[PDB]
């Protein structure tokens, strides 16, 4: 009755294994993790305290390809098979998705102790933005940064921003090669070229000021492009490796944060600190509640982060607005009439207050954000085991949770005929968003306590957007002027492009071209240009 002799053959087997020919060793080096992965998934499927796990063939990679390319189609199939809670493996991480309004509640209103945004995102954002801000700091520091930034985003600030943003749009119609309205009465444009440029010109001028805007007229502009390239999903898996892409990013962050710091120390030197812009505002208001001041480097870093985030969501969105309106001359006509009524045939100057009396214009923004949530997925890293209410499911620490309000935006259940563009579904409901009941303050002002609205373009809970009113102001001024100045349509045979879901925001697949025409071919934009 000896089993020790089997224990010998274990040792013998280990030794024969290590002496296999290389062609068999390498072969096993592949085949063993493969086989184990399959065996492990099958075993996992037995657990009742775990949501269903999407099956996958390639270890570590998981469902990355189909999630990367077609995430809403991936979610819809998964939802059909498993219901609203399911997991899937993604480049080494386990993502637990919770679709629908209950998922919105589960993730956006999760306790600070249970989940972490910075543990999910910092490896992406910190190299691009800089140290000490956003996700390179505790949540309570982020809470207060948002509060500081929000202090320059007031009604009175928006009133002074509107004419600056308008000036920038008109200058862009005047000077950009894409328009030249004093020289051309019609032309073709790629909206993925024009919208990122108009967005940076308008956001710089208003949030950063004239100096920083003037800088965009120089080679300095290319640093933003460089810094921009580092803001990609590839940094999500390979945040640092010695390629040139990574060094131009690092250099740009230094050069740009350097430029903001120079301005700041200049203003403080001359005591030229007023109430013009976000820089003025963070110079007067950036001391945390424990007495610690933000450094000039941290202020600069925060400016980069805020502008870059606001850059991509807004540029994506105005691109989509243009793209949906290009096959909807009926809606352009309707918007044009509202412009004529609110601005007295154009004899009134556009102001912030008049912007608020343009419901059809804001409804168009609202509907575009419904069909095109620029962030298709939001993540948190799970920090403690989470029990899913009314289920037997437990999400263990180390998993990630993924929420996707953009997906629910496209469901017929919540939005009848959700794939049709219809600004009138928001009739009598043109607010950018609104809390349906009770409110709470996490540090940056009172916001909706419930996050169960099927429409959640700005998220909710402690990580909620603070730029929505600035985005509406910017998009509003911009579209008010496009509409009053131009008509536009598609080249023959072209229609609304499909989304490119592989980028950081879900911009349209380019080239996305429209043909524009002056409503008033003889109208001229004044001012000087070289
Ligand atoms: C159409 C435009 C925009 C949309 C749809 C949008 C959307 C969002 C969403 C969904 C979040 C929540 C992120 C999460 O829960 O993980 C967020 C957060 C945030 N956004 Fe926006 N955003 C827009 C424009 C802007 C602009 C223009 C700014 C700045 C001027 C801005 C600044 C911020 C900041 C500072 C946060 C907080 C991040 C956090 O607490 O984790 N956003 N935004
Ligand atoms: C972290 C980042 C993000 N990017 C992509 N998928 C998910 C994300 F959370 C983002 O939320 C995007 N964003 C939101 N509003 C504008 N931009 C963000 C927030 C604050 C910020 F200062 C800069 C910034 F990029």
From TrEMBL:
Binding positions (heme): 465
Biological or metabolic pathway of the protein: Steroid biosynthesis; zymosterol biosynthesis; zymosterol from lanosterol: step 1/6
Localisation per UniProt entry: Membrane
Entry similarity comment: Belongs to the cytochrome P450 family.
Protein name: sterol 14alpha-demethylase
Source superkingdom: Eukaryota
Main location: membrane
PANTHER family on file: 24-HYDROXYCHOLESTEROL 7-ALPHA-HYDROXYLASE (PTHR24304:SF2), CYTOCHROME P450 FAMILY 7 (PTHR24304)
Top EC group: oxidoreductase
EC number assigned by the record: 1.14.14.154
Binding site for heme b: 121, 135, 146, 380, 463, 465
CDD domains: CYP51-like
UniProt record, GO biological process: ergosterol biosynthetic process; methylation
A Pfam family hit: p450
Source organism: Saccharomyces cerevisiae (strain YJM789)
Catalytic reactions on record: a 14alpha-hydroxymethyl steroid + reduced [NADPH--hemoprotein reductase] + O2 = a 14alpha-formyl steroid + oxidized [NADPH--hemoprotein reductase] + 2 H2O + H(+); 32-hydroxylanosterol + reduced [NADPH--hemoprotein reductase] + O2 = 32-oxolanosterol + oxidized [NADPH--hemoprotein reductase] + 2 H2O + H(+); lanosterol + 3 reduced [NADPH--hemoprotein reductase] + 3 O2 = 4,4-dimethyl-5alpha-cholesta-8,14,24-trien-3beta-ol + formate + 3 oxidized [NADPH--hemoprotein reductase] + 4 H2O + 4 H(+); 32-oxolanosterol + reduced [NADPH--hemoprotein reductase] + O2 = 4,4-dimethyl-5alpha-cholesta-8,14,24-trien-3beta-ol + formate + oxidized [NADPH--hemoprotein reductase] + H2O + 2 H(+)
GO molecular function: heme binding; iron ion binding; methyltransferase activity; sterol 14-demethylase activity
Gene3D superfamilies (alphabetical): Cytochrome P450
Cofactor dependency: heme
Transmembrane regions listed in the UniProt entry: 26-46, 53-69
Keywords noted in UniProt: Heme, Iron, Lipid biosynthesis, Lipid metabolism, Membrane, Metal-binding, Methyltransferase, Monooxygenase, Oxidoreductase, Steroid biosynthesis, Steroid metabolism, Sterol biosynthesis, Sterol metabolism, Transferase, Transmembrane, Transmembrane helix
GO cellular-component term (any): membrane
């Amino acid at each position: 009755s000896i089993v020790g002799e089997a224990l010998e053959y274990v040792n013998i087997g280990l030794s024969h294994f290590l002496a296999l020919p290389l062609a068999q060793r390498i072969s096993l080096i592949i085949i063993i993790p493969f086989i184990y992965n399959i065996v492990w998934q099958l075993l996992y499927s037995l657990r009742k305290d775990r949501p269903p796990l999407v099956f996958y063939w390639i270890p570590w990679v998981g469902s990355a390809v189909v999630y990367g390319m077609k995430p809403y189609e991936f979610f819809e199939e998964c939802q059909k098979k498993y219901g609203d809670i399911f997991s899937f493996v993604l480049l080494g991480r386990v993502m637990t998705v919770y679709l629908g309004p209950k998922g919105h509640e589960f993730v956006f209103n999760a306790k600070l102790a249970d989940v972490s945004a910075e543990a999910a995102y910092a490896h992406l954002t910190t190299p691009v933005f800089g140290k000490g801000v956003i996700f390179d700091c505790p949540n309570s520091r982020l809470m207060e940064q948002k509060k500081f930034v929000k202090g320059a985003l007031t009604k009175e600030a928006f009133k002074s921003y509107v004419p600056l943003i308008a000036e920038e749009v008109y200058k862009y119609f005047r000077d950009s090669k894409n328009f030249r309205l004093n020289e051309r009465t019609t032309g073709t444009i790629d909206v993925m070229v024009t919208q990122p440029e108009m967005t940076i010109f308008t956001a710089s001028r208003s949030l950063l000021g004239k100096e920083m805007r003037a800088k965009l007229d120089t080679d300095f502009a290319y640093l933003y492009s460089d810094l921009d390239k580092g803001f990609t999903p590839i940094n999500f898996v390979f945040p640092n490796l010695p390629l040139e892409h990574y060094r131009k990013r690092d250099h740009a962050q230094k050069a740009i944060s350097g430029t903001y710091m120079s301005l700041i120390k200049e203003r403080r030197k001359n005591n030229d600190i007023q109430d013009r812009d976000l820089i003025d505002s963070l110079m007067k208001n950036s001391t945390y509640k424990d007495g610690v001041k933000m450094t000039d480097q941290e202020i600069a870093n925060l400016l980069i982060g805020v502008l870059m985030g606001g850059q991509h969501t807004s540029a994506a969105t105005s691109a989509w607005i243009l793209l949906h309106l290009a096959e909807r001359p009926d809606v352009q006509q309707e918007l044009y009439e509202e412009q004529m009524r609110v601005l007295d045939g154009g004899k009134k100057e556009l102001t912030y207050d008049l912007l608020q009396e343009m419901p059809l214009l804001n409804q168009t923004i609202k509907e575009t954000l419904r069909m095109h949530h620029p962030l298709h997925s939001l993540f948190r890293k799970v920090m403690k085991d989470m029990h899913v209410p009314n289920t037997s499911y437990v999400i263990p620490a180390g998993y990630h949770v993924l929420v996707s309000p953009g997906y629910t935006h496209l469901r017929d259940e919540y939005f009848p005929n959700a794939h049709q563009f219809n600004i009138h579904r928001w009739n009598n409901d043109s607010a950018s968003s609104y809390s349906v009941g009770e409110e709470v303050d996490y540090g940056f002002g009172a916001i909706s306590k419930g996050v169960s609205s099927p429409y959640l373009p700005f998220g909710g809970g402690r990580h909620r957007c603070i730029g929505e009113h600035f985005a509406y102001c910017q998009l509003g001024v911009l579209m008010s002027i496009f509409i009053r100045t131009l008509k536009w349509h598609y080249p023959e045979g072209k229609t609304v492009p499909p989304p490119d879901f592989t980028s950081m925001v879900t911009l349209p697949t380019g080239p996305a071209k429209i043909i524009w025409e002056k409503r008033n071919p003889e109208q001229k934009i004044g001012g000087r240009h070289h």
